[PDB]
Amino acid sequence: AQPAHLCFRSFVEALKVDNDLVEINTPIDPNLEAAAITRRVCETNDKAPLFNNLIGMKNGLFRILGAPGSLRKSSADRYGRLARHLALPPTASMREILDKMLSASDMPPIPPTIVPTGPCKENSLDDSEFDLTELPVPLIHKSDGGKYIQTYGMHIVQSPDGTWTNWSIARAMVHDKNHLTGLVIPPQHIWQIHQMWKKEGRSDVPWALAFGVPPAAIMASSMPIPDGVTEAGYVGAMTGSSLELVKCDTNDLYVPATSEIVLEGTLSISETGPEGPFGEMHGYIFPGDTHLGAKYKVNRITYRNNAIMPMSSCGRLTDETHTMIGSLAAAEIRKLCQQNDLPITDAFAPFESQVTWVALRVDTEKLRAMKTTSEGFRKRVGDVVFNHKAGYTIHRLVLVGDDIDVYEGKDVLWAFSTRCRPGMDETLFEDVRGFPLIPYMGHGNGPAHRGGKVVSDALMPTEYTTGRNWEAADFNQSYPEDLKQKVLDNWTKMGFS
Amino acid sequence: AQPAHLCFRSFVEALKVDNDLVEINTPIDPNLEAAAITRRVCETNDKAPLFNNLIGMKNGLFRILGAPGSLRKSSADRYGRLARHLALPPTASMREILDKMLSASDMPPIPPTIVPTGPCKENSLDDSEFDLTELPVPLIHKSDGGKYIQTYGMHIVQSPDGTWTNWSIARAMVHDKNHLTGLVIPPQHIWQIHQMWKKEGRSDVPWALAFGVPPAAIMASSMPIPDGVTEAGYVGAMTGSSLELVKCDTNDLYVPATSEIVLEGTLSISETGPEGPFGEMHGYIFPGDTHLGAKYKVNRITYRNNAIMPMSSCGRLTDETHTMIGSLAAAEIRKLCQQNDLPITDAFAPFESQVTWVALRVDTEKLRAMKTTSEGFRKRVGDVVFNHKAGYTIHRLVLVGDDIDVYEGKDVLWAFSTRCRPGMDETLFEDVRGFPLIPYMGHGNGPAHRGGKVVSDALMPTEYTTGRNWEAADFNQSYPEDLKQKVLDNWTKMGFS
Ligand SMILES: Cc1cc2nc3c(=O)[nH]c(=O)nc-3n(C[C@H](O)[C@H](O)[C@H](O)COP(=O)(O)O)c2cc1C
Ligand SMILES: Cc1cc2nc3c(=O)[nH]c(=O)nc-3n(C[C@H](O)[C@H](O)[C@H](O)COP(=O)(O)O)c2cc1C
Ligand SMILES: O=C(O)c1cc2ccccc2[nH]1
Ligand SMILES: O=C(O)c1cc2ccccc2[nH]1
Numbered sequence: 001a002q003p004a005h006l007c008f009r010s011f012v013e014a015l016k017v018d019n020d021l022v023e024i025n026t027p028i029d030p031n032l033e034a035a036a037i038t039r040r041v042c043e044t045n046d047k048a049p050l051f052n053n054l055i056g057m058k059n060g061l062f063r064i065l066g067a068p069g070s071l072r073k074s075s076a077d078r079y080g081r082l083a084r085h086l087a088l089p090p091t092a093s094m095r096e097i098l099d100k101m102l103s104a105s106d107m108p109p110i111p112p113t114i115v116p117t118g119p120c121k122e123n124s125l126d127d128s129e130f131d132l133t134e135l136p137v138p139l140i141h142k143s144d145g146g147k148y149i150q151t152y153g154m155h156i157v158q159s160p161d162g163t164w165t166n167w168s169i170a171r172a173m174v175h176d177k178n179h180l181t182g183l184v185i186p187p188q189h190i191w192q193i194h195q196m197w198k199k200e201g202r203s204d205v206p207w208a209l210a211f212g213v214p215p216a217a218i219m220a221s222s223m224p225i226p227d228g229v230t231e232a233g234y235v236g237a238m239t240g241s242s243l244e245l246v247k248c249d250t251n252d253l254y255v256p257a258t259s260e261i262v263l264e265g266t267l268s269i270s271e272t273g274p275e276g277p278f279g280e281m282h283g284y285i286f287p288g289d290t291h292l293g294a295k296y297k298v299n300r301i302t303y304r305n306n307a308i309m310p311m312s313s314c315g316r317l318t319d320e321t322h323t324m325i326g327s328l329a330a331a332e333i334r335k336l337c338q339q340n341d342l343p344i345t346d347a348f349a350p351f352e353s354q355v356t357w358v359a360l361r362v363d364t365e366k367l368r369a370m371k372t373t374s375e376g377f378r379k380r381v382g383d384v385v386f387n388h389k390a391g392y393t394i395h396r397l398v399l400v401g402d403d404i405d406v407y408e409g410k411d412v413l414w415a416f417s418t419r420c421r422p423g424m425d426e427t428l429f430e431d432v433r434g435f436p437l438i439p440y441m442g443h444g445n446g447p448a449h450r451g452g453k454v455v456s457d458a459l460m461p462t463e464y465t466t467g468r469n470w471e472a473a474d475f476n477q478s479y480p481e482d483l484k485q486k487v488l489d490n491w492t493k494m495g496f497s
Numbered sequence: 498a499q500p501a502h503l504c505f506r507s508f509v510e511a512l513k514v515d516n517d518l519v520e521i522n523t524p525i526d527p528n529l530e531a532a533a534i535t536r537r538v539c540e541t542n543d544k545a546p547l548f549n550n551l552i553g554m555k556n557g558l559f560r561i562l563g564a565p566g567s568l569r570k571s572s573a574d575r576y577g578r579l580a581r582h583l584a585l586p587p588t589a590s591m592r593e594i595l596d597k598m599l600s601a602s603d604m605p606p607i608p609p610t611i612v613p614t615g616p617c618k619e620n621s622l623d624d625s626e627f628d629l630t631e632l633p634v635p636l637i638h639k640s641d642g643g644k645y646i647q648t649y650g651m652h653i654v655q656s657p658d659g660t661w662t663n664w665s666i667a668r669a670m671v672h673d674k675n676h677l678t679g680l681v682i683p684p685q686h687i688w689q690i691h692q693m694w695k696k697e698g699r700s701d702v703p704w705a706l707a708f709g710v711p712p713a714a715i716m717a718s719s720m721p722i723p724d725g726v727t728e729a730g731y732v733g734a735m736t737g738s739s740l741e742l743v744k745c746d747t748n749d750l751y752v753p754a755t756s757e758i759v760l761e762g763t764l765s766i767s768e769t770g771p772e773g774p775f776g777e778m779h780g781y782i783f784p785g786d787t788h789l790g791a792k793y794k795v796n797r798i799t800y801r802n803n804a805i806m807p808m809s810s811c812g813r814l815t816d817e818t819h820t821m822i823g824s825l826a827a828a829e830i831r832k833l834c835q836q837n838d839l840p841i842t843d844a845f846a847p848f849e850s851q852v853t854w855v856a857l858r859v860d861t862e863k864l865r866a867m868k869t870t871s872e873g874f875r876k877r878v879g880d881v882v883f884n885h886k887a888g889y890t891i892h893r894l895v896l897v898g899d900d901i902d903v904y905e906g907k908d909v910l911w912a913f914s915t916r917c918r919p920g921m922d923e924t925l926f927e928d929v930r931g932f933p934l935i936p937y938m939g940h941g942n943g944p945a946h947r948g949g950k951v952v953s954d955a956l957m958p959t960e961y962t963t964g965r966n967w968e969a970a971d972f973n974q975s976y977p978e979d980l981k982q983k984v985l986d987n988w989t990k991m992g993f994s
């Protein structure tokens with residue numbers, strides 16, 4: 001077989017064909033070694049590692065693919081792994097990937113198709129045949145509080161009334177032979193659904209966690225598409241094809257037919273267990289910072305022959321927690337702004353900001369027609385974005401005019417540093433939900449869950465009135481066209497590189 | 498021949514020997530073409546251009562060297578041009594260059610030596626033999642308001658009482674056959690001295706402007722060394738050698754003996770003329786933004802045979818206005834902090850910030866012993882730096898702990914973005930002098946000359962108390978030493994780059 005965006009096994013073959021895979025066939029320790037190799041790959045934009053000989057792999061569980069959504073070294077195919085999640089050419093731009101991810105937002109859903117079996121049913125282990133402590137679950141960072149089996153799988157939970165089935169990524173680690181613990185926090189959909197089941201009060205939440213799902217599905221899992229929208233039908237619409245699902249054996253949830261590994265069980269409405277600490281997306285671990293997390297019971301494991309577990313070795317730049325969390329939040333923010341009649345053309349979370357900022361490119365012709373001011377406009381943008389779940393992870397919004405490419409972190413930093421007067425050109429938001437994972441929130445001086453957000457206006461004053469009133473002091477803008485071309489045409493004749 | 502740091506002609510030969518020069522021997526137009534080549538070099542870190550055939554060069558005036566203090570492409574000798582200004586090895590680190598620039602601050606000055614002649618006397622033109630409009634003065638940016646002869650020369654002015662002779666860079670453009678106009682603004686020393694002569698009220702200010710001075714001298718010219726300190730004796734101390742000066746022909750000022758070009762005349766205490774606009778260090782020009790500037794009268798020109806004028810094509814990253822203005826301000830700030838008993842180890846102006854920020858590395862052992870708080874410490878640092886001339890150009894200070902290399906813009910941006918909560922972890926300074934050249938100041942929403950400054954505390958809370966309480970989620974810190982070395986030793990055997 002099936003296409004790469006619809007079948008993780010084919011996606012791995014796509015990375016090989018692209019010369020973007022290293023297959024490691026000698027024994028590799030899941031205790032730190034796999035994740036350290038993966039971490040070095042992410043910090044250097046190297047090829048993705050496939051660990052085919054993982055110390056502790058028993059009865060087909062499991063191989064590991066690291067860095068599934070990280071960057072390539074070349075600028076021409078920088079985002080090629082992400083393009084391979086979506087059937088795009090490997091040279092696709094970030095604008096094209098985010099447009100593809102947003103495309104289903106004004107299309108009818110294409111609901112999934114139930115099939116009677118699939119590769120995920122090739123093997124099974126009941127409640128008497130597996131032990132999660134006996135699998136080659138990675139220790140990802142040396143101070144982690146557990147072996148994080150779940151960094152790139154899909155949790156599947158459904159509202160009590162059946163009308164909404166949510167697919168999302170949220171971390172989880174092994175607690176004992178048949179339980180995980182993990183992070184289930186507001187305002188995430190897995191938490192919203194959990195709350196529904198707690199208020200009903202009758203049973204634990206039927207649950208599955210599928211690893212190595214269709215790559216188009218894992219991308220939507222990482223995107224804050226709207227409340228109540230079933231990710232399966234959004235992915236159907238975006239790919240133009242109904243996704244094939246099979247029923248779980250022990251519950252009535254449906255998992256992708258080609259999933260590599262499937263856990264079936266329950267998310268408790270009452271129990272907790274120790275969770276964390278973990279080396280997280282902003283680049284830190286606080287050793288010993290353990291909290292009580294949600295508790296998941298595993299009743300059954302099903303899996304493909306020669307199953308492969310995807311792993312994110314997350315932390316400092318650049319991994320899936322940057323390329324997918326930041327970019328996909330920015331995409332949804334862009335749409336959100338446009339639906340609120342704000343003149344936003346583009347949005348991106350700069351990697352330099354540890355994806356805590358989003359830069360918002362403004363159509364300044366439209367801004368001018370609004371006849372507004374910085375104070376007013378900053379307030380409107382911040383109220384729309386920071387009061388919505390799509391803004392949760394983002395603590396600074398940078399407004400820039402049409403001359404800035406928000407996908408170029410150098411140009412966002414230039415505009416921020418030169419066009420936004422500290423204090424006067426900014427509005428602080430202290431009564432909005434904060435992202436506690438950012439160290440300055442959860443480990444900082446103020447409330448972990450509230451405030452610490454800002455809108456930084458890097459629009460210049462005439463951008464609101466009569467139009468841009470500068471030219472850049474750069475090669476592009478400070479020399480006429482004929483001269484620039486002469487210089488470029490003579491560059492290597494004259495002796496330059 | 499004489500040594501490169503003491504003789505600009507030798508410095509040009511040093512750049513050739515270093516394979517860091519392109520000699521262009523075919524005709525090049527000083528109307529935009531020389532500066533566009535220079536601009537492209539600065540934006541790509543290419544070799545410095547030497548224009549030996551400048552259209553309009555008459556009777557030896559003049560050749561142009563562009564990009565004299567810009568960056569090399571290699572990381573190993575990134576700062577090699579700056580090292581060649583100072584007799585340092587071309588692999589010198591920025592810490593070593595700034596230490597060299599600060600070295601004379603606790604040494605006795607070595608006053609200059611007067612010699613009876615030098616190469617700068619090889620040719621002369623009186624008041625009847627030159628016309629500044631007839632020289633091949635560059636047009637640097639297409640919207641500049643004049644031909645900026647002066648981007649990398651040394652103004653020489655002396656206090657009325659003779660006790661202080663100041664060397665500094667400040668821009669100037671041709672006004673007519675025998676005058677320049679330029680920027681003389683507070684709190685710069687050329688302005689402080691000008692004010693002294695205005696208050697005396699008796700005569701215009703005796704003046705010289707020397708181009709292609711000793712490279713060690715042009716570096717101190719770009720540094721805010723303290724009020725009242727004669728740059729010549731500071732350069733003497735830093736180089737361990739008394740600088741050789743010759744007297745001007747028409748006044749009693751002294752100019753470096755090996756200066757390429759010397760203008761002699763007066764800076765008026767009464768007259769002004771149109772000045773600017775200019776494509777400036779933060780990357781902008783505002784066309785048509787002309788103001789009245791100080792007016793300089795030129796009475797005599799002296800020059801070397803085959804004289805070379807240095808030119809900065811300034812604007813967007815990376816040129817002399819970044820490498821020298823930012824770095825040398827940061828060096829003086831570091832010293833200033835240490836002299837005020839603040840536990841600052843290192844300072845640098847990140848290029849990413851368009852050298853509007855300085856990152857201050859804190860010795861957190863010392864900070865802990867202070868038993869202070871973020872609010873208190875931010876206030877003390879900002880009061881010391883933003884009330885001093887060394888802080889003039891800097892609008893944001895970022896405080897970081899010992900784990901951050903402030904010379905690495907990626908690590909400063911990481912620390913800023915993840916450790917400083919917007920608003921709560923910052924203190925705004927509105928009653929301090931502002932730098933009007935930053936667009937958000939002079940072309941912004943508030944007072945051009947006041948406020949818009951901030952101290953951003955990216956120290957974490959335990960850095961003030963008990964010590965760092967995290968490990969980075971990176972390859973360096975999240976894996977033991979033996980594992981890391983195993984990974985590095987097996988990297989290319991396994992198939993990575
Ligand atoms: C590698 C990776 C790790 C993530 N880890 C978490 C996590 O631990 N908790 C969490 O709530 N979201 C995590 N996310 C982000 C969510 O998937 C994202 O916020 C998504 O919008 C959640 O889906 P929902 O909108 O259906 O709630 C992770 C995403 C990726 C790519
Ligand atoms: C390429 C270049 C251009 C500069 N242009 C100006 C200018 O136009 N005006 C100015 O006051 N300073 C300018 N500077 C900065 C000053 O040289 C610097 O602030 C120095 O500290 C001034 O000397 P002083 O401390 O003796 O006043 C320039 C520096 C460089 C490297
Ligand atoms: O628990 C965590 O590491 C975590 C929570 C979370 C929420 C949103 C985005 C990223 C996330 N990571
Ligand atoms: O007039 C200017 O371009 C200019 C003034 C100034 C003052 C300090 C540093 C850089 C500077 N550039």
Ligand SMILES: [K+]
Binds near residue numbers: 168169224225231
């Ligand atoms: K989702």
Ligand SMILES: [K+]
Binds near residue numbers: 461937
């Ligand atoms: K602004």
Ligand SMILES: [K+]
Binds near residue numbers: 664
């Ligand atoms: K100086």
Ligand SMILES: [K+]
Binds near residue numbers: 871
């Ligand atoms: K802080």
Ligand SMILES: [Mn+2]
Binds near residue numbers: 168225
């Ligand atoms: Mn959802």
Ligand SMILES: [Mn+2]
Binds near residue numbers: 686721722723726728
């Ligand atoms: Mn001075």
